Ligand binder design. Structure first.
Ligand SMILES: Nc1ncnc2c1ncn2[C@@H]1O[C@H](COP(=O)(O)OP(=O)(O)OP(=O)(O)O)[C@@H](O)[C@H]1O
Ligand SMILES: Nc1ncnc2c1ncn2[C@@H]1O[C@H](COP(=O)(O)OP(=O)(O)OP(=O)(O)O)[C@@H](O)[C@H]1O
Ligand SMILES: [Cl-]
Ligand SMILES: [Zn+2]
Ligand SMILES: [Zn+2]
Lengths: 69, 69
């Protein structure tokens, strides 16, 4: 089933690329109607970046949650 | 840059999962406005499936080509 190919992919994408900053915690993320937005950092590193004044790692990547658009 | 994260991902997704049927040739694919549709089979196995009467591997998965939706 094609939606499952998509879901296993998103499951893998999320598991193997941790927070770009601490390199260990997994990323923050939210559901965005029909997309999964994976943020670049976990919530702790993100809050921290604001406090330290660094916006270098700010961002996200959206993923369609279904096989067909 | 976030679009590059998306592009490298799509580049990897395409490289490491070959045709579901011959398991060696890479998949057929087309650009679909703002999505990349990766088909399940290469063109040769797909044409062949029609000739043999097998629709088991027919399908695709669409991928947003950008980081933001
Ligand atoms: N955990 C995080 N890691 C990296 N960047 C983040 C994280 N959380 C938010 N950002 C980024 O901070 C910038 C401003 O964040 P913002 O919360 O506006 O994103 P958003 O998903 O649009 O939320 P909202 O819809 O509430 O504005 C955006 O680029 C967002 O990608
Ligand atoms: N190379 C392929 N491997 C697997 N399935 C395919 C392949 N090519 C087409 N199909 C599938 O065959 C079914 C009918 O194909 P079709 O060509 O209608 O797809 P399509 O991208 O909608 O093309 P069109 O817009 O011309 O109809 C669809 O499920 C499509 O996913
Ligand atoms: Cl996607
Ligand atoms: Zn972190
Ligand atoms: Zn094949």
């Amino acid at each position: 089933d094609d939606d499952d190919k998509k879901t296993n992919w998103l499951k893998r994408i999320y598991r193997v690329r941790p927070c770009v900053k601490c390199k260990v915690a997994p990323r923050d993320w939210k559901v965005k109607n029909k997309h999964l937005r994976i943020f670049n950092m976990c919530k702790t590193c993100f809050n921290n970046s604001i406090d330290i004044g660094d916006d270098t790692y700010h961002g996200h990547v959206d993923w369609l949650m279904y096989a067909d658009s």
